[PDB]
C-alpha cells in the first residue's frame, strides 16, 4: 500500500488527502490507531 509510509510522510493534516486517496475512509481509523499509539 505504502499508505502507511505515505501517511506517516504525508503532509501533516492532508493525511486527509492521502488516506482518502488510497481508499482509507478511515483516515479516521488511520489516525485512531496512530492515536491508540499517540493517544
Amino acid at each position: 500500500e505504502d499508505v502507511w509510509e505515505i501517511l506517516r510522510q504525508a503532509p501533516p493534516s492532508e493525511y486527509e488527502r492521502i488516506a482518502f486517496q488510497y481508499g482509507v475512509t478511515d483516515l479516521r481509523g488511520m489516525l485512531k490507531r496512530l492515536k491508540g499509539m499517540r493517544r
Partner: protein, 375 residues
Amino acid sequence: DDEETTALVCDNGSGLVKAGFAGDDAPRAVFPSIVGRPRHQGVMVGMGQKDSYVGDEAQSKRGILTLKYPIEHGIITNWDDMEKIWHHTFYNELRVAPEEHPTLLTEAPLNPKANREKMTQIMFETFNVPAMYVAIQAVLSLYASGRTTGIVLDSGDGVTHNVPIYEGYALPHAIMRLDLAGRDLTDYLMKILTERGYSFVTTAEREIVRDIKEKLCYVALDFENEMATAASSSSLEKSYELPDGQVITIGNERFRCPETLFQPSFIGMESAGIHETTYNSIMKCDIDIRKDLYANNVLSGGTTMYPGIADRMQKEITALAPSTMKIKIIAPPERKYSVWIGGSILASLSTFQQMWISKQEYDEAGPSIVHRKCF
C-alpha cells in the same frame, strides 16, 4: 495519575448515552436515556430504592419505574435528569472526574442554542473538565464516515438526517431531518400488534417491542408482491417468545413496521420517505456531485440496521436516479459506534485541541462565547 489527559468521548446516542475516550475503540458507556418513576410504594423497610437510578439499572426496575428521556425528541426537555445522567456516567460507568479529562460534545442540528449554552457552562461547573467541546452528532458520524465527499443518511439511535458532504463539504441548505425514530416505528408496532389482538402499552412493554424490532423486525425490498407474499407466506408467520414467557406471534408486521420511513402515511406523517429526501437533497447538490453521492450514499444509524436497507436505498434511487450514474449507498454495520468512532477521532485528533471549550474562554465570554467561531 497519568499523563496530560484523555478527552472524554461522551455520546448520548439518541436512545442511549454512550462514551469512551479519545483514541478509544469502544464506547465504554452505553445505556438508556430514560428516567423512571415507581408508583405504589409498598411500605418497604430500609432503603436503596432509588426514585431515579435509570441509567442502566432502572430497566431492572422497569414497570414500577416509568420512562423519561430528557432529549425526548432529540430535544432535552430537562437537564438535571440528564445532569445526574452524566454524573451516573462519569462516576459509575465513567466513574471518572470530568475536571481532568477533556470531552467533545455530540449534538444533532436543529438545537436552539441555549441548550448547548447551559449544557456547556454546567459541564464546566458541575464538571470542571479540563475543557469541553461540542460537535454535531451528524458531523461526528461524518468524519466517522471518512468519505469526506457525499451525503450520509443518519437514521440512528433514534435520529434522522441527510448529510450531503463533499471532501468534508456539506450543504446545510440541502441537509434535512426525518423526525422518524425507531421509537416511532415502535409506536406503529404497538398500534398494530395491540389492535391486532394485543394489549401493549406499558413502558417496558415498549421496551419489549423495541427489542422486537431490533431483533426480528425487518423489511422486504418490495411491498405489493411482497404483500401477496405476506398474504400466505408462512415462513414469516413466526411467533416470538414474549419476554413474559409468552411467544408473541409475528407476521407481516416484522417488516410493515419500519418500511413506512418511506411512506409516513402509515405514521400518517405528511413527510416523505428517507430515500427521496436523499434524492431531493442530491438534486439540490451541484450538477455532478450526484455521482459523488452515488459512491458516497452513506447510510448511518443502527436502528436502521434492518434488512434490505440499502437494497431499497439503491432500488428506489435507481427508480429515480439516471442509470447513467452508478449509485452506491454506504452503511457500515457498526453505525452506532461510527459516530462515537469519528468523535473519538476528532477529539483524539491531537492537531486539534485548539478547539476545545476552555473554562476560561467561556468565562470571559460566558456561554454565548460558544456560538460564533466555535461550538
